[PDB]
Amino acid sequence: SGFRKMAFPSGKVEGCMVQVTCGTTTLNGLWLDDVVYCPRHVICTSEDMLNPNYEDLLIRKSNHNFLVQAGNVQLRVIGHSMQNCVLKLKVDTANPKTPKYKFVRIQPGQTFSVLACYNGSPSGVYQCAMRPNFTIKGSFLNGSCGSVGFNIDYDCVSFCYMHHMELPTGVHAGTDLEGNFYGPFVDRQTAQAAGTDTTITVNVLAWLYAAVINGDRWFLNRFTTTLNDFNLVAMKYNYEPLTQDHVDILGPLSAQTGIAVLDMCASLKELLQNGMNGRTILGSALLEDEFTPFDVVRQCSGVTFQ
Amino acid sequence: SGFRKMAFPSGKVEGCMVQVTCGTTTLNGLWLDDVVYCPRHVICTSEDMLNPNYEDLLIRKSNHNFLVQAGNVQLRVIGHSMQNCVLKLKVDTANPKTPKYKFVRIQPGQTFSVLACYNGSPSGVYQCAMRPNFTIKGSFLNGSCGSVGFNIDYDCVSFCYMHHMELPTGVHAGTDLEGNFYGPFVDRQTAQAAGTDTTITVNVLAWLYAAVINGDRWFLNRFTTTLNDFNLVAMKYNYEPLTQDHVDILGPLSAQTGIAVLDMCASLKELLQNGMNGRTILGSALLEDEFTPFDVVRQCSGVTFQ
Numbered sequence: 001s002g003f004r005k006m007a008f009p010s011g012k013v014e015g016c017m018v019q020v021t022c023g024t025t026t027l028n029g030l031w032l033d034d035v036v037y038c039p040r041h042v043i044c045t046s047e048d049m050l051n052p053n054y055e056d057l058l059i060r061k062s063n064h065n066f067l068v069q070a071g072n073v074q075l076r077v078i079g080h081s082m083q084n085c086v087l088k089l090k091v092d093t094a095n096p097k098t099p100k101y102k103f104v105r106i107q108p109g110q111t112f113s114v115l116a117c118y119n120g121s122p123s124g125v126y127q128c129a130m131r132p133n134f135t136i137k138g139s140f141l142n143g144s145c146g147s148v149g150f151n152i153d154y155d156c157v158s159f160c161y162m163h164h165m166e167l168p169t170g171v172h173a174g175t176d177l178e179g180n181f182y183g184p185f186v187d188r189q190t191a192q193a194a195g196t197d198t199t200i201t202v203n204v205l206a207w208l209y210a211a212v213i214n215g216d217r218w219f220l221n222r223f224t225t226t227l228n229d230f231n232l233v234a235m236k237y238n239y240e241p242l243t244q245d246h247v248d249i250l251g252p253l254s255a256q257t258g259i260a261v262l263d264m265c266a267s268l269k270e271l272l273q274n275g276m277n278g279r280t281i282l283g284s285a286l287l288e289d290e291f292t293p294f295d296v297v298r299q300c301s302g303v304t305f306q
Numbered sequence: 307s308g309f310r311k312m313a314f315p316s317g318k319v320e321g322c323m324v325q326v327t328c329g330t331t332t333l334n335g336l337w338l339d340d341v342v343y344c345p346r347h348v349i350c351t352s353e354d355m356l357n358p359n360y361e362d363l364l365i366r367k368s369n370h371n372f373l374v375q376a377g378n379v380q381l382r383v384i385g386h387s388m389q390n391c392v393l394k395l396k397v398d399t400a401n402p403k404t405p406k407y408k409f410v411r412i413q414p415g416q417t418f419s420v421l422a423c424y425n426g427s428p429s430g431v432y433q434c435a436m437r438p439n440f441t442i443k444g445s446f447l448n449g450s451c452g453s454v455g456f457n458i459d460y461d462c463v464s465f466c467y468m469h470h471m472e473l474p475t476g477v478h479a480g481t482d483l484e485g486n487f488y489g490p491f492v493d494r495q496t497a498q499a500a501g502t503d504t505t506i507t508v509n510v511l512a513w514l515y516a517a518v519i520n521g522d523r524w525f526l527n528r529f530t531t532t533l534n535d536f537n538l539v540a541m542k543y544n545y546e547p548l549t550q551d552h553v554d555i556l557g558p559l560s561a562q563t564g565i566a567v568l569d570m571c572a573s574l575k576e577l578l579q580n581g582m583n584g585r586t587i588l589g590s591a592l593l594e595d596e597f598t599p600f601d602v603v604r605q606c607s608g609v610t611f612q
């Protein structure tokens with residue numbers, strides 16, 4: 001038993017992580033087969049970052065402007081081509097460590113793991129989520145750009161994120177691997193604000209089942225509510241409305257525990273209307289929304305990967 | 307900026323993780339050079355687990371009783387020898403992926419990362435700490451035994467933990483890599499209880515500096531206390547006494563911020579005597595003790611590894 005914020009093993013992504021240097025700019029890039037994906041503001045300067053027209057800047061460049069480096073060994077670039085906000089550098093060697101992989105575009109609510117890098121050398125791995133406001137509460141310093149988020153389903157790596165920029169409230173933003181930003185942010189230095197966040201309700205309920213599975217049960221009650229009446233108190237507390245499709249995915253968990261989904265909504269209801277009054281759930285003094293219903297199953301029934 | 311519970315990249319440990327099967331018992335084992343380290347109750351049965359005399363059980367065994375398996379390929383055992391609570395299986399091949407490594411025995415307070423495995427296939431990676439009561443608040447299911455905790459200092463892996471058993475309050479216990487249990491627990495199924503936990507004070511203060519570095523500052527104050535007078539309120543709240551050696555390691559952080567260590571003790575003091583009254587620090591409604599003063603430096607000044 002026990003329940004920790006857990007991350008996918010990062011071995012397979014470490015094998016693709018390289019250093020990309022251009023001008024006076026060094027960031028990280030992802031090397032799959034014979035292609036190296038990095039963010040395109042690697043071609044910018046400090047003065048460029050104010051309102052670049054990346055199509056112009058890029059057309060001046062030649063191949064030899066791109067110092068790519070895997071470990072110490074220098075990759076030879078032989079092509080480039082900008083797709084949305086990522087650059088695609090065709091080099092002269094395919095990555096021997098290329099794993100099974102795909103590119104995906106996640107929805108808000110879905111979670112993933114992040115391997116933070118600087119100069120191509122991994123530094124850490126955390127697990128976080130795609131906020132309702134298309135931001136992520138991450139941990140990034142200068143040079144952290146080009147690091148990726150990802151899920152692993154047995155042998156296959158689903159890349160879903162690349163890092164580009166920090167917003168002034170300390171939150172972060174970036175794109176899928178096809179270059180398209182999540183949310184309405186642009187890779188340039190002009191003011192822009194995240195937009196009010198909400199609480200991912202379906203993930204809170206998934207987490208509350210994880211609390212039940214692990215012996216925590218003080219928050220339960222006899223009460224039951226109908227979803228119409230839950231969603232009017234959840235709004236008030238600025239939670240995502242709950243769809244019948246949420247209740248569907250929560251069924252399995254509802255039956256490993258014999259607690260009706262509609263009863264667990266009645267407990268959360270009381271938790272919001274009274275708070276938590278000195279106690280913790282799963283060692284957290286807060287309701288926790290960064291665990292998906294399929295996250296809970298993972299950790300509580302022990303799925304592995306290879 | 308930003309601040310997440312972060313884990314070392316697990317690539318190098320994944321490369322050593324193998325399956326060890328004996329009798330009707332399957333657990334995970336660690337293969338470095340030509341030696342495979344697993345926990346010894348892999349030789350037990352269900353009835354044995356009540357009061358085994360591992361020296362007897364082991365002397366009946368032959369080499370061919372140990373089904374070792376790295377991926378699908380069957381390692382050939384050619385020797386064994388029990389050192390404290392770990393078995394050491396000499397096989398006929400050295401691990402091509404053996405990294406630079408060492409074995410260490412951590413103190414309470416120090417943290418490490420955990421790569422949870424089942425049947426040899428990694429499942430997740432989390433970061434946690436060696437509680438003051440020689441337990442760890444981990445997340446483990448059946449078959450999780452033989453998984454390790456570890457730190458990485460540039461290129462070198464310091465193994466400090468192997469998994470053996472869960473305690474009935476949901477907490478966990480295990481050994482260093484030389485077989486010796488942390489704390490007073492034994493690998494057998496007879497009753498034993500963790501002992502009251504405390505709060506690792508030096509790590510709370512390290513974390514509070516991380517809060518300062520990242521813009522959170524509502525808990526600060528003009529006040530200052532002398533350490534004699536701090537330690538009498540910290541006791542009350544069942545915190546570790548603070549040594550002058552703590553203040554020493556906290557200096558660097560004290561000066562990236564111009565906050566005297568002795569002033570930060572005066573803020574924590576008020577936080578315990580009043581609680582936190584609706585607000586969060588670093589997105590946690592709690593004071594967080596699983597970040598070391600050298601953890602904070604890592605993440606807030608971006609050290610990498612290879």
Ligand SMILES: *[C@H](O)[C@H](C[C@@H]1CCNC1=O)NC(=O)[C@H](CC(C)(C)C)NC(=O)[C@@H](NC(=O)OCc1ccccc1)[C@@H](C)OC(C)(C)C
Pocket residue numbers: 027041049140141142143144145146164165166167168169172187188189190191192307
């Ligand atoms: C690339 O590795 C780098 C990583 C960031 C450094 C620290 N954390 C990071 O996420 N990204 C950038 O430096 C990026 C550069 C581009 C804008 C993508 C070209 N810049 C930022 O992240 C800035 N954010 C920003 O300027 O957004 C627009 C804006 C401007 C003014 C007011 C509000 C919003 C960061 C560095 O600026 C702060 C938001 C931290 C002030």
Ligand SMILES: *[C@H](O)[C@H](C[C@@H]1CCNC1=O)NC(=O)[C@H](CC(C)(C)C)NC(=O)[C@@H](NC(=O)OCc1ccccc1)[C@@H](C)OC(C)(C)C
Pocket residue numbers: 001333347355446447448449450451452470471472473474475478493494495496497498
């Ligand atoms: C090996 O992989 C396995 C992993 C555990 C299964 C789930 N989580 C784990 O940590 N470890 C064991 O099964 C271990 C077997 C030995 C005792 C090491 C031989 N057993 C336990 O962890 C039990 N704990 C236990 O029996 O401790 C002594 C005890 C006995 C009675 C009352 C209190 C303490 C677990 C399985 O038993 C519970 C504590 C969960 C009831």
